[PDB]
Design a binder for this molecule. Structure first.
Ligand code: HEM
Ligand code: HEM
Ligand SMILES: Cc1cc(N)nc(CCc2cccc(CCc3cc(C)nc(N)c3)n2)c1
Ligand SMILES: Cc1cc(N)nc(CCc2cccc(CCc3cc(C)nc(N)c3)n2)c1
Ligand SMILES: C[C@H](O)[C@H](O)[C@H]1CNc2nc(N)[nH]c(=O)c2N1
Ligand SMILES: C[C@H](O)[C@H](O)[C@H]1CNc2nc(N)[nH]c(=O)c2N1
Ligand SMILES: [Zn+2]
Lengths: 401, 404
């Protein structure tokens, strides 16, 4: 009923009553455990009501008439339209809760701090881009990054979704040239050709910042060049290895995830983008030396000076380390918020902790909390965790086309 | 699609379907309403079925499924369990029974070498003492002057209305950890509760750090006896680093052979209570679990101090600068001493190749992702970008209640 959750570093034995809330199921079954897998009217009121109780409880005003005369209002609204709309305050609480509820997210200690720009008063892709510059301008805060989420209108069935066509407001470009080899970012290959398709002058630099494809409910998407000025790019240097930056490397400073769906009390917003700040490894481990991506490992080391004739030689580790460090130093230098996998993990164990007090636990995808490198070297690694689907929650959806 | 688990490799974009999981006659903790994947600690008529489950595998493995040979092996255990209550396995039935447990077991990265396994049959051992002899014999084959082979040494099974053979020492090689007055420990924080028993069962401790414990060898309804390994058998690797000379001086040593020995091996509804198996290490085990864990040898601080590292803040990556070196230096030692060992990269490759191989024979492979992926440099390795399907198959090495 309530899974015993020993931590193995301290001997800390905790118990989860939060799961019993999760009213919506996942990939695992009694006989097999798909833990590691990457992807998956009558009922609307059901989720409305509950969420609205979720809400009022927060501000402790649960029960009181305001409560029930909103439960009055939403009950009727759907009973006469098919759908309902959330007040500002309501979606603020909800968008927050989605973050709080996302089990792949190590950066959760921070969920309280979140700006919730309300873009539901938008109807043109030409307003969209604007609503997004006001987002990027507020989050970048020219160094001191701040966590925020601009939310475009809800989906309603008689028509298309508003969508952002690229999977992170900022991404570098990808250019497969006869060779079957890519200049720039190989993830962002499929996307870049679409911008070429829907009219775009392409670049060729290792890191060319892209445009923006925004589509409004039924309508050919529209291209919008991000004012270069508004894109905080971080040069990349090594604190002790002078040879480095000659490599000509960098990364953007703002991680805005645009391709996800937001679910609140049943209502779903297809486009609702959001952006905190980077966790070192993300850039220097995955986004770089990872083959399926920038894949730098080899050079880094050939430079460094390490026997790639053999793996046991351990060049791949010694290389990451320095790239993963060469990132923090640059970032800390160029004075741009950034949190390292160690700094990160401690604080989550405090989240993990603080949450246990409030709610009776916190769902967490273990296989994802644990950093991409040096696992055993973080506290999270030695901590059993439970992951289950809650709500309001962030979900994936089909690539717009 | 195919009404079966669907397993993608997010590096080659390949897919594969698990058909084998519908073999698992054992459920785990996970329900579709939450996932306890992370979690560490997890008759007669209802024994007889467990048995038939086995034989059928044995036969449909020599490929004689259907024969009289088969249909009368089943018409004999039915006879044995009927009149006995238990049932003894035939010779090569067991040898099979072991390799399957290994093959079946979800947390073991080292399964490409799965059919190498030597089965030493010791189902005749009836003296607490004789046990020692076997074990000793094992180590010498297993050690092989350093060319470590794999192997296992089944001692007899349980009877309803008998005692149990048991090997107390969780592992056959355990470094003594003496509770200090400091409130601290000199030795190996893990092997304390056991060091503490050796003393109560009559062991005079030395007081080093890498003292080798003695074995506490139980035999049914007999208080365990105490045996010391002749040091010539217990091969030991001093630790140095290829560049950092000072490393050597840390005094750090470590032992070649892992032998797990407090695990119940279950074949066909049988229980082998003392059933100890060995192989060779994977560097990170020693250099990350053993020598770096905050609650073991935890050398990470001392080592970072020497490489002259800003251990004041985490954004110097001192920890990551250290482990890496410490993990390397551990490999560079078995290079040198000509002792067997496999590094995470090398190892995590064979796994895919095992996975690839196994997709053909069984059409599936049980894998406990968290345990398959190495405690340094996850993404750095192939296994990392691979979805996996954990589940309970038999033969099976089970966890077992410690005797006292
Ligand atoms: C403040 C800085 C933050 C850090 C350091 C952080 C950390 C992370 C990391 C490392 C991941 C895994 C990303 C990956 O490897 O794919 C993640 C996942 C996630 N994060 Fe954050 N996070 C932060 C803020 C946020 C914010 C502001 C939101 C938006 C409300 C958010 C929502 C999510 C969601 C929904 C996932 C699930 C990943 C998925 O299933 O695709 N995070 N978080
Ligand atoms: C050939 C050399 C081998 C290597 C390199 C290897 C590697 C590993 C490693 C690294 C682990 C996880 C260790 C941990 O983090 O605690 C493991 C688990 C395991 N291994 Fe092996 N292994 C080898 C041989 C064997 C053999 C010979 C057996 C016995 C037949 C075996 C049975 C198991 C079992 C049952 C587990 C998981 C048990 C559990 O904790 O639930 N392995 N293996
Ligand atoms: C806020 C935030 C903070 C932070 N430190 N890092 C990120 C970027 C990493 C990330 C976080 C959350 C979700 C995704 C999208 C992953 C994804 C999933 C699918 C199904 N398809 C894709 N193309 C991409 N990426 C975002
Ligand atoms: C052959 C072998 C090869 C190799 N590379 N590593 C090991 C050691 C890792 C291991 C493999 C299998 C089982 C266990 C035991 C886990 C355990 C359980 C309990 C109950 N207490 C413990 N202290 C440890 N440990 C053994
Ligand atoms: C196949 C595997 O499940 C997948 O690559 C996961 C594993 N763990 C991860 N952990 C983090 N932090 N980020 C990730 O993208 C992933 N990817
Ligand atoms: C709590 C945590 O899940 C557990 O202790 C696991 C994590 N991953 C591991 N992975 C390996 N290889 N070995 C381990 O002991 C562990 N410990
Ligand atoms: Zn699971």
């Amino acid at each position: 009923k309530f899974p015993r959750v020993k931590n193995w570093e301290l001997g800390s034995i905790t118990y989860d009553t939060l799961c019993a809330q999760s009213q919506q199921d996942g990939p695992c079954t009694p006989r097999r455990c798909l833990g590691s897998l990457v992807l998956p009217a009558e009922q609307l009121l059901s989720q409305a009501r509950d969420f609205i109780n979720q809400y009022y409880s927060s501000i402790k005003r649960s029960g009181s008439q305001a409560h029930e005369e909103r439960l009055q209002e939403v009950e009727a609204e759907v009973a006469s339209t098919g759908t309902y709309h959330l007040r500002e305050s309501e979606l603020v609480f909800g968008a927050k809760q989605a973050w709080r509820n996302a089990p792949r997210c190590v950066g959760r200690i921070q969920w309280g701090k979140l700006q919730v720009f309300d873009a539901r008063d938008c109807s043109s892709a030409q307003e969209m881009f604007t609503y997004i510059c006001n987002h990027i301008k507020y989050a970048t805060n020219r160094g001191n990054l701040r966590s925020a989420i601009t939310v475009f209108p809800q989906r309603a069935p008689g028509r298309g979704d508003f969508r952002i066509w690229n999977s992170q407001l900022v991404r570098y470009a990808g250019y497969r040239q006869q060779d079957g080899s890519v200049r720039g970012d190989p993830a962002n290959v499929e996307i870049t050709e679409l911008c070429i398709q829907h009219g775009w002058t392409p670049g060729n630099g290792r890191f060319d910042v892209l445009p923006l494809l925004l589509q409004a409910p039924d309508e050919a998407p529209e291209l919008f060049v991000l004012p270069p000025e508004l894109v905080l790019e971080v040069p990349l240097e090594h604190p002790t290895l002078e040879w480095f930056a000659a490599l000509g490397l960098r990364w953007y400073a703002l991680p805005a995830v645009s391709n996800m769906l937001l679910e609140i009390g049943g209502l779903e917003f297809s486009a609702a983008p959001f952006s905190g700040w980077y966790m070192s490894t993300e850039i220097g481990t995955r986004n770089l030396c990872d083959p399926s991506r920038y894949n730098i490992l080899e050079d880094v080391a050939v430079c460094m000076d390490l026997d790639t004739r053999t793996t046991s030689s351990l060049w791949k580790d010694k290389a990451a380390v320095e790239i993963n460090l060469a990132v923090l130093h640059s970032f800390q230098l160029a004075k741009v918020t950034i949190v390292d996998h160690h700094a990160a993990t401690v604080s989550f164990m405090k989240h993990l902790d603080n949450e246990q007090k409030a709610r009776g636990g916190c769902p967490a995808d273990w296989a994802w909390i644990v950093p991409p490198i040096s696992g055993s070297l973080t506290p999270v690694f030695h901590q059993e965790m439970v992951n289950y689907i809650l709500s309001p929650a962030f979900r994936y959806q089909p690539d717009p086309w």
